[PDB]
Paper text:
However, neither rapamycin nor [name] alone can stably bind their target; instead, both are “presented” to their target as a tightly bound complex with a ubiquitous, abundant cellular protein, the peptidyl prolyl isomerase [name]-binding protein ([name]). We show that a subset of compounds encoded by X1, in complex with [name], bind to a topologically flat surface within the coiled-coil domain of the human centrosomal protein [name] (also known as [name]). [name] is a core component of the centrosome and is predominantly composed of sequence predicted to form a coiled coil. [name] is a component of the centrosome, the primary microtubule-organizing center of mammalian cells.
[name]–WDB002–CEP25011.4 crystallizes as a heterotetramer with C2 symmetry, in which CEP25011.4 forms a homodimeric coiled coil and binds one [name]–WDB002 complex on each side of the coiled coil. Consistent with the rapamycin and [name] ternary structures, [name]–WDB002 binds [name] via a composite interface, with [name] binding to the constant region of WDB002 and presenting the variable region to [name]. The variable region of WDB002 buries an extremely flat, hydrophobic patch of the CEP25011.4 dimer interface composed of Leu2190, Val2193, Phe2196, and Leu2197 from one protomer and Gln2191, Ala2194, Met2195, and Gln2198 from the other. The C16 hydroxyl group, the only hydrophilic functional group presented to [name], forms two hydrogen bonds with the side-chain carbonyl and amine groups of Gln2191 from one CEP25011.4 protomer. At the opposite end of the structure, the aromatic starter unit of WDB002 makes a π–π interaction with Phe2196 from the other protomer. Side chains of Gln2191, Gln2198, and Gln2209 from one CEP25011.4 protomer form hydrogen bonds with the side chain of Asp37, and the main chain carbonyl groups of Lys47 and Gly19 of [name]. Arg2204 and Ser2189 from the other CEP25011.4 protomer form hydrogen bonds with the main-chain carbonyl groups of Lys52 and Pro88 of [name], respectively. Two mutations, Gln2191Ala and Val2193Leu, attenuated the binding affinity by twofold and fivefold, respectively, whereas binding was completely abolished with the introduction of the single mutations Ala2194Thr and Leu2197Phe, underscoring the importance of these hotspot residues in WDB002 recognition and binding. In the [name] structure the 80s loop extends away from the target interface, as compared with calcineurin and mTOR, most likely to accommodate binding to a flat surface.
Author numbering:
A (entry chain D), C (entry chain C): 2146 to 2228
B (entry chain B): 2 to 108
D (entry chain A): 1 to 108
The structure:
């Protein structure tokens, strides 16, 4: 008699929970896409940094040769100014 | 290539030469106006030396056409920016970029 | 009975759906926390890149002045070998 | 209060980097508890830097300079020789003592 009523109540409680499950799943799926894109961003910035450091190294290699050539040319100028 | 359109006029006579440091503020956007970077958000003007290939080709060509004080829109096609690869999470493959650039000074 | 089967079926469906909701809720919370942390590492790498570019620029300025000094030293050496 | 160098595998004991030389290395960077924050090995890509050009943290400059070609070593670096009070949010926390597993592959 009264058991027909409670079965309908629990059906409506199940629909409500089913709706909540979907809201949390979708929220989670959206956050998962943001994270993957943000993780991709980290990898790309790392590789940008790797390039910038390779550039610093290339500059310092060139700076090394210029410092040597300047030192020798200064030495030769001092030798000439004596004689 | 790169297209240069004037937002706000500069002095119209002080253009940067190779070996000069350009000091700018910029906002970087995709073609729909979505921002991906900005020196203004950091309150930190960006600096680079013209002609040393420190920046993308579109900037090398675009900024050299600007005079001190000028604010300009640079529309940069992917061959003058990041091409077929882009930068995952930041710049899609084959993206046209829009930069709002202001040339603040030269040093 | 008739309803005891459907009551047992509704109990099982509700608890299974609730458990799934709880897992999605937890996942969404953990992904949000992980996203915030990855976003901080993105900012830090941006600042590392800013520093490395300032280092490139500094090397390029120093190369320019080193080259200029080398040129002045060469002109001076050449003038000593004439005068 | 500096950097400590503990040999994992010995080098040739003869070829030491000079300032101005490019060091080619592999490294794994870890926090004091052993949590990995970076690795050139995971990238399959040796890391390069020139010694004596202020390109790396002081703990590296001092530690790698003590290594010979072929040597693998553990560098334990105090915060003052690394990233200090500030660290790098999301990667290196405040006042982090760092441990680098470093191998000197060659000089160029
Ligand atoms: C991918 C960075 C790229 C590397 C490169 C250098 C030389 C030639 C070709 C490429 C080069 C780098 C230069 C020097 C380093 C600057 C470091 C800090 C200030 C930047 O915020 C970096 C971390 C990000 C990386 C991702 C980029 C999409 C972009 O967001 O810069 C960006 O706005 C951009 O597209 N920028 C930054 C502002 C100037 C225009 C353009 C550029 O040329 O970038
Ligand atoms: C914060 C990076 C720091 C900046 C700096 C430069 C000169 C003097 C003082 C500091 C300097 C930079 C060097 C040259 C750039 C190299 C670029 C690529 C290979 C690195 O993966 C960068 C993107 C990350 C940044 C965050 C760091 C926590 C660490 O994960 O490197 C790292 O492992 C480290 O602690 N590294 C990297 C390998 C050598 C040891 C040490 C270091 O000295 O780094
Ligand atoms: Mg030197």
């Amino acid at each position: 008699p009264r058991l027909q009523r409670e079965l309908e109540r629990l059906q409506a409680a199940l629909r409500q929970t089913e709706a909540r499950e979907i809201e949390w799943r979708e929220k989670a799926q959206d956050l998962a896409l943001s994270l993957a894109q943000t993780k991709a961003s980290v990898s790309s910035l790392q590789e940008v940094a790797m390039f910038l450091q390779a550039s610093v190294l290339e500059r310092d290699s060139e700076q090394q040769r210029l410092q040597d050539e300047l030192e020798l040319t200064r030495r030769a100028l001092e030798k000439e100014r004596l004689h | 290539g790169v297209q240069v359109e004037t937002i706000s006029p500069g002095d119209g006579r002080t253009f940067p030469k190779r070996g000069q440091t350009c000091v700018v503020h910029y906002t970087g956007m995709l073609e729909d106006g979505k921002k991906f970077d900005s020196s203004r958000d950091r309150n930190k003007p960006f600096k680079f030396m013209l002609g040393k290939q420190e920046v993308i080709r579109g900037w090398e060509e675009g900024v050299a056409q600007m005079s001190v004080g000028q604010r300009a829109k640079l529309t940069i096609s992917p061959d003058y920016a990041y091409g077929a690869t882009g930068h995952p999470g930041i710049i899609p493959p084959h993206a046209t970029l829009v930069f709002d650039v202001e040339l603040l000074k030269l040093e």
